[model samples]
Target: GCKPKGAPCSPLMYPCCTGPCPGAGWLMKDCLCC
Candidate 1:
C-alpha cells in the first residue's frame, strides 16, 4: 500500500501515496514521500 504525505514510508521500497516514494529521506525515523 501507499502512504500519505506525512505518513511513514520506506526509503525506496514503499510507495509514497504520491507518484512514487521518497520525497524526503530519513526523517528521524521513517521516510517522507510527498
Candidate 2:
C-alpha cells in the first residue's frame, strides 16, 4: 500500500487498492496494496 508519507513500507506485499484488481495483484494483511 502507499505509505502515509514517511511510513516505513514493509518488504512484503499488501493490498492497497479498492474493489477488483486488474493484473496480478495479491491480497495482503492490514489493508494495503502491492
Candidate 3:
C-alpha cells in the first residue's frame, strides 16, 4: 500500500515528492507512487 497508482495525491502525498509527476501523463491526478 505504498504506491497510489492512478489515485488522488497531493503535497502530503507521493507525487508531491517529485511535483507534477505521473499526472503529467494524465493517468493519475498527481502522485503515482509506484
Candidate 4:
C-alpha cells in the first residue's frame, strides 16, 4: 500500500503518497515511481 505523506518507497521513490492512486486516502504500492 501507499506510504505516509513523506514516506519512502520504490527504487526511484519520486514522491511518497503522491495521491490519485485508488484507496480513499492512499493506494496500493505497485512499485511504479512514475
Q: What are the models' TM-scores? A: 0.18, 0.19, 0.17, 0.19
RMSD of each: 7.5, 8.5, 8.3, 8.3
True-vs-predicted CA distance for residue 1, candidate 3, Å: 15
Each model's backbone clash number:
0, 7, 0, 0
For candidate 4, lDDT tens digit of each residue in 1-34?
6543544544344444644355443335643323
Cα lDDT tens digits for candidate 3, 1-34: 1333454454343343233444433324533442
Error of 2 at 21 (Å): 2.2
Where does model 3 exceed 4 Å of error? Answer: 1-26
The runs of at least 3 residues in candidate 1 whose Cα sits more than 4 Å from the true structure, single-residue gaps closed, are: 1-4, 13-15, 18-34
* Predicted structure with the largest lDDT when compared to the true one: 4
TM-score-based ranking:
2, 4, 1, 3
Candidate 1, residues 1-34, lDDT tens digits: the string is 2344555434455334433435443333333353
Report lDDT (CA) for all predictions.
0.41, 0.39, 0.38, 0.44
Residue 34 lDDT, candidate 3, scale 0-100: 29
The candidate with the higher lDDT, 1 or 4, is 4
Q: If ranked by lDDT, best first, what sequence of candidates would result?
A: 4, 1, 2, 3
lDDT of 3 at 4: 37
TM-score of 2: 0.19
State which candidate, 1 or 3, has the greater TM-score: 1
- The sequence of per-residue lDDT tens digits that candidate 2 reaches over residues 1-34 is 2222223434245444434345434544333443
Candidate 4: deviation at residue 28, Å? 18
The better candidate by lDDT, 2 or 4, is 4
